[PDB]
Design a protein around this nucleic acid. Structure first.
Length: 251
RNA sequence: GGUGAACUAUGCCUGAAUAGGGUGAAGCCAGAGGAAACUCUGGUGGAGGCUCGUAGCGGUUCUGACGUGCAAAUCGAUCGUCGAAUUUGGGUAUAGGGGCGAAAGACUAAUCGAACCAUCUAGUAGCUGGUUCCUGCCGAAGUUUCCCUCAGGAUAGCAGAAGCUCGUAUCAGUUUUAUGAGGUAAAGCGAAUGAUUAGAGGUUCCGGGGUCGAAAUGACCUUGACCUAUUCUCAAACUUUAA
RNA sequence: UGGAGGUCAGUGACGAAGCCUAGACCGUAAGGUCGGGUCGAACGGCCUCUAGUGCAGAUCUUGGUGGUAGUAGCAAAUAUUCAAAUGAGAACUUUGAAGACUGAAGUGGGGAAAGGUUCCACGUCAACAGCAGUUGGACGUGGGUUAGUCGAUCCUAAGAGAUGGGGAAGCUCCGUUUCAAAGGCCUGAUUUUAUGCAGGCCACCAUCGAAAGGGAAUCCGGUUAAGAUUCCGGAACCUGGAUAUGGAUUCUUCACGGUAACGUAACUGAAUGUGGAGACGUCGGCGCGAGCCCUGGGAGGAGUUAUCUUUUCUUCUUAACAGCUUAUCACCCCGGAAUUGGUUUAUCCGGAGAUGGGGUCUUAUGGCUGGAAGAGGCCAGCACCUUUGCUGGCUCCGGUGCGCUUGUGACGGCCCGUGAAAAUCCACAGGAAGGAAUAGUUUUCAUGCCAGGUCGUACUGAUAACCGCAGCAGGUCUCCAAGGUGAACAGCCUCUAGUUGAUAGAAUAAUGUAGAUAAGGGAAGUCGGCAAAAUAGAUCCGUAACUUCGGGAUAAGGAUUGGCUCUAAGGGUCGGGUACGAUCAACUUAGAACUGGUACGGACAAGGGGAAUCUGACUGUCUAAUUAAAACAUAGCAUUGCGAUGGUCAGAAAGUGAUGUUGACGCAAUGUGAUUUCUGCCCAGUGCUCUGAAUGUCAAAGUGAAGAAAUUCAACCAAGCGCGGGUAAACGGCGGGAGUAACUAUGACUCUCUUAAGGUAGCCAAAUGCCUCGUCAUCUAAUUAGUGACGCGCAUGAAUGGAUUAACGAGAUUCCCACUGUCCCUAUCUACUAUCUAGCGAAACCACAGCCAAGGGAACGGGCUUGGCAGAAUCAGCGGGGAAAGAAGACCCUGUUGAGCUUGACUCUAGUUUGACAUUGUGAAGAGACAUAGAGGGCUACCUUUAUAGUUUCUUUACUUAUUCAAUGAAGCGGAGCUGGAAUUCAUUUUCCACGUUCUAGCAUUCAAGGUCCCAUUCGGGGCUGAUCCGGGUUGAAGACAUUGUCAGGUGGGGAGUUUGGCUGGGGCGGCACAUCUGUUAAACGAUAACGCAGAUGUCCUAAGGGGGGCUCAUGGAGAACAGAAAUCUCCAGUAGAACAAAAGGGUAAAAGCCCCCUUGAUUUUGAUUUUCAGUGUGAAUACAAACCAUGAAAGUGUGGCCUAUCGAUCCUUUAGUCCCUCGGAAUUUGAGGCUAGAGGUGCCAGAAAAGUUACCACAGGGAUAACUGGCUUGUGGCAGUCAAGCGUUCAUAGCGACAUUGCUUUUUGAUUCUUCGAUGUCGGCUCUUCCUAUCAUACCGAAGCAGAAUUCGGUAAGCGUUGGAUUGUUCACCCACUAAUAGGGAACGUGAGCUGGGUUUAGACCGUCGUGAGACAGGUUAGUUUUACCCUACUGAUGAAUGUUACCGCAAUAGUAAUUGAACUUAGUACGAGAGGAACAGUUCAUUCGGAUAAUUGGUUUUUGCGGCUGUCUGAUCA
């Protein structure tokens, strides 16, 4: 057999992301000195569409505390944020939509987004349109804070990790059917070359583990071990279960 | 170990190209009806991977032409599509068990179910083909045994050549005489084994039946449950005999 | 024969070698010698030496050359002609005259890529331009490409890529700002001075990458053989560069004005910061320009003028740049708006200030002027052979629009799509610095001065400049774009411009290719309506089922359409004493009358339609070059993994990467495949996943006995595996048998075995059903087709998706209407061919060749044999033959030849996972702790234990510096703390904070202002503090874990390599004839074959071996008390009819059988022999020798089994055999290695270690071997005969005919394997000829159970015919019909260079069944390139030399031959018939079918382009 399609993606030749029209890496500002003993005010000058991203981005201008210069930052726009608005970043920032409070400074049940995984990483969690993080609670001894992630996962991290109060804007995007192969075409041409997708069973055995046969059929179980090697990991990888999901999963 | 993305496949970057019709979406205007909810009518508007149809892009049928062609894929008519998942130039990226693939094992320079170039490499071939002067003498084999042996080998045989040891060759694909061995042909089955056609005595040792009703071994026949003399026809795996 | 040593003191320019020579001689021959000719420098004989030494073949190599053959051919792209000139030479060159075409998405005018000189000129024609050539993209010689402004250069884009550094043995790889000590300009200084020496801002990080992206700036006129936005003449602009004049400071230093938007000629402005431009998609309508189009007047020129619009055509132009002026939008000021107003085509805007009234700028765009009329263009006139001008005019006014194109503007629509970057330029904020006696600044005002290098610049850009081997009908990016028709860059015609190229000439036979027409019928043709035809535009009318409500729809269906003369409706522009008109203007509609050979979208252009089924939702995509599809995508649906020290993937590695400028509304991996309605049951199997009592398994390391050590273990032993659970929108799967309802039939019901579950909802002879052409209905005259419906469905079925489904489809299919040459049944026409000619001129192929019949032959001969015969040279055709050509068959088999693909094949492997050790740096805890110790259990060795020196726990931690991770321009860390807050201390500090910023789209920078002590407060300064001190750990996370290195287990078709027997009446399946044994085949020694026949073996036995002894067996006859057919018991008879392990055959009777006693000879040693045989091995073992034994009184017998079968090499391991030998510097004890004899096993049995598939396929071969024909055979098939039991009513034989039996045929199928695998094209049909007869019809006749008619049987007879259709690819079949009949066959199962291609039988795809899978299927289905004749022969026709010429009329050998059948009337309603019924011969009139002619008529055909009509355009109109 030959190298299969999912194997060829790691080379990154034609599968690198199409990044020409993007507005930059959407990041929180650097956790420098002001954000950790006070707050710093900034103004959102524009909210723009980022190609390949469902969520809008916010351009915010902070002042440099150490030099006479206007420092722009690329925040993910939370729902309700408008141009001409002040957003306050730091530990003493007020609990308002658009502010960049540390997780330890917010009460239980706070809806945050673009949350840091580690203090200073400038934001990792709940960044896609319509997503958010909830504050389940705090653990002041060994200063920590447990949060609820958009996938439903529970995660405990340091209370110094910052986030934007509110929910990412652009929510409800996947509620509209694309209705047309052409709409899926335009969606993925600004993202990466992952579309359209030929089924493995419609291939020949040289091209895919699913390929071949006098009928289109997988032939072997499509659930694949975690310890399988590349070229073998096609189908449902390390699947705990399969089939239509009935009932709940205690989520 | 090298060389190719000038074709083509796919991403990206930067540019360019696409008559005229049909249909008539939302939004909007004006009337009409209604208690209200709202409904109706006439316009306006110009939507759509809509539609007829050029350029373009494809390539359905004639299984038309041609089929040592205009052409290693073309020509003509007929066709699909024609504002978009559209067509396309240049730049750029991905390179051979690699790429790329809306997937045909397709495409990757007329090369693809693994490109091309050189070298290893005069690769190996129990297989096919060929194997170059004359005359003289001799002269076969397709058989034995073994072998992943069955289109091949080894071995023995058959053949050639070289000879070596004597002055009548202890021999012979022959006969005779003598003496053995043989189970074939034929023959045989009133001989064994096995088959096999017909008639010739008696006898209730279970059962088929009756003069008379168990009438006692009862004045009858029927497998013979106990009997010898015949008789027709046979044998590769029968035989006394026996060429 | 080449070369070498020796010799002939060989031949030779008075001629060596070579070559030619139906000249000679010699030799059987290979060859040698010589005559003659040609020839010019070397070469022979003999003795020897030596080798790259001898050709007919190798689809041999290289080269050369034939027949074919003056042949095929030189036919696409409408088309040429006349004359002259130039030339030997003109169909093709030039010039003129015509005729035509491209017809502005051109045959026009430019470019990009590419080419490279093809450009241009002059000479010139050997070759090239497939004819020609005087011509040329040819040949030879030259000339030609002129830039500050046009491009490159500059900039960045995807992306390439150094350095720092890190990998890599290394070529090199990563990496691109990363863990790097990566930086200019002003009066600083400004006289050893230009860095001798305190003058700031940083936080820049290479570079390459666009001749279509971004960019500084140029235009017009002229000019050349060729260059020009480059040269020239005018007229501009931009960039760089020093001062300088013109207007402003010394009485306000850095302008005024406008309430304001903002204006003007200027009108300082550093660091630092900020903003704008550069800079952006697409579509639609509207507006406005430019150019083009149209048009009026006038001023010129040309055309037409028998007649006729003041007519037709054409010129009448104005660049860059400068000034003034000119805008939708936007903004400002002023009354402050509901009766809401303004307003676009499009419906937006207004108290956030509308309407209204007043108000700036961007040469957007236009106008005027300069440029600039002097240019250019149009007329008229003079120059009259110095390669040259001069003169006079005109060049002026307008109008029009759904026009075309382009640009612009203001808008509106779309997106889960929102449509580069940088260079570069400016602006703003700011307030560092500087400015008073002729000065200072303004060089963003005007004017002035100088320079602007380098590389490219010709031409083509394509039916001849590029690529396709070429001057190739192919391919190759783009700009401009006239008139008419018309909706239209459709088609058609025309203008400007450009071409007129393409081998040609002759009347154009057959057959063709391309284009057409057709009486009557109308799909009867055919697999199939393939092909063609058929109302096609527009207007009006009218439009069904169904539907996802959007469609379907142009459904269907109908009417009209010309010309002319009229009518009606529809618009734009003004002076207001508080309803009025002349002007002017354009094509859209609608109507009427009239008119005509009822014609009119008149050419052109231009949908056939409908009723249904299968299938895929749709649009889209692919097998370039046989498959466009139902295949793939798709949206939708569902499932899976992953929260970043992550999932998926990459890399040799790396301080390395893609996803990722990412973050679950995400990325990654799969399946299904719109909507609707649904998606049932099964987790047993295979996976996948989740879990941890281990008297379960268990690797390295590590830990545990004793002399000496090398050397076995155990171990909540790591993971894994096992154990347990989950999971089917994972792979997948989803049953039988029997009975039963009061007529039968069926079975609601009922047991019974069984599965993980037994197929649910649905659906169906479906693209899935074998049987099967299912059954019923419908459709038809007739239907293997279609549709509807139906069942015990070979083998339907639910996201391996089920059912449905509007719309859509170059997709399967059926029917109907229309339509037709598809056909009945052909005919006719046109062009180009073919043909003939002049030139030019191939190829395939070719052992030799070319007439048959039979024969025999390798079983289908051109040759050979016997016959028929046979006469030059030939032309056009033609498709019978040459088993024609094209390719070392692609099918099949063989090979110890592959490859692609797959898997629980064998052997591994990247990766991954797990453990140990190592970079792994201190302590604590009941350290499984070493000797003396209770209990719980039907004094007794796992279970909280402690008293007696001493290094270790299950395993958690009081750490950080090693290592790891992440950010930052390493900006603020850890403490002490300075005024105060605090549920507040019981004695001045025992924690922590403001370190004093949250209405607002402002601002924040110049050692900082201030404050306190100091200075010649001389560009104004210094110190401290504002802004606390101390510690220099940049800051966090992480931590002796990870990571990394090594080793060790697991996993690992992701990957690699390899393998995947043999025989065989082809191979496969089957079997084993593969190692053996008995009988037979087997033919009386021995041997002897077949997948011959009948059987057997891989064992069994301490006795079933050995010895000895005793005794007779099977079976019948003869008795008995419950005793019998079978229990015994006793006599008889009994040649073995029993038994002896087994198969069979032999053998055995005081035994070889049966019973008893004793035993292990079934033992040692090693030789000889027999069988298979090579006289090898193996297996059996026959007879001895030397021992030891057993038994028996003894003779003797016994070296396994009464005999013939019952089995195993090398290497390795292991055992036994006196430590026998060796371990080689010498020893001792372990270990190892040797010698002899066994065992462990190879059954494919003289002995490899081994799974599939290929319909994607490959190679070497095979006719040693299958799939056709042919040949042998003829079982089977088919067709006859003999006999005659019987049938035929009482009769074998009219007609039949059993039981038997003899044949024939090769129109069946087997059997075989002879021919062919360096290929003989295969099914069927179509077409066409001939033959056979085993006669269906027609002629004559015989017979009958022939009384007539009709039949039946038979004879001679193949002369003559033997059909049209529905269904099916079909042969076959079947049905509907038709006259006389609808007989059977052959000819390579006749006939594919004759067709066709429906079927079969490549590659695509679907289904069902099967398979884990790749895949398979004599299962169904759909799509799937049909090549070449010009040769020989044959045939059909056509010429023709030659037996004196030439001409005419003849004969007639030989060959061919042709007519056929029916009906009606009459006979005759007769003969016959005691009825029905019902002939025949003679006669007459017609008609099947076939044949030969012919064209009077009728019909068909039309380039008679003959006449007429009609449309569009062009010739000005008319005529034409």
């Amino acid at each position: 057999g030959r190298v299969i399609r999912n194997q060829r993606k790691g080379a990154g030749s034609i599968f690198t992301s199409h990044t020409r029209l993007r507005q930059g890496a959407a990041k929180l500002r650097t956790l420098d000195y002001a954000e950790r003993h006070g707050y710093i005010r900034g103004i959102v000058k524009q909210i723009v569409h980022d190609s390949g991203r469902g969520a809008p981005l916010a351009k915010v201008v902070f002042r440099d505390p150490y030099k006479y210069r206007l420092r722009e930052e690329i925040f993910i726009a939370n729902e309700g944020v408008h141009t001409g608005q002040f957003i306050y970043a730091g530990k003493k920032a007020s609990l308002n939509v658009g502010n960049v409070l540390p997780l330890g400074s917010v009460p239980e049940g706070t809806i945050v987004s673009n949350v840091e995984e580690k203090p200073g990483d400038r934001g990792a969690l709940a960044r896609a349109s319509g997503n958010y993080v909830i504050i389940i609670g705090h653990n002041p001894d060994e200063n920590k804070t447990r949060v609820r992630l958009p996938s439903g996962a529970k995660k405990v991290i340091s209370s110094d990790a910052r986030g934007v109060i509110g929910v990412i804007a652009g929510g409800g995007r996947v509620d509209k059917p694309l209705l047309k192969a052409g709409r899926a075409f335009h969606k993925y041409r600004l993202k990466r070359n992952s579309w359209p997708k030929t089924r493995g069973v419609a291939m020949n055995p040289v091209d895919h583990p699913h390929g071949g046969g006098n009928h289109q059929h997988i032939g072997k179980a499509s659930t694949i071990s975690r310890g399988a090697v590349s070229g073998q990991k096609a189908g449902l990888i390390a699947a705990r279960r399969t089939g239509l999901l009935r009932g709940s999963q205690k989520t």
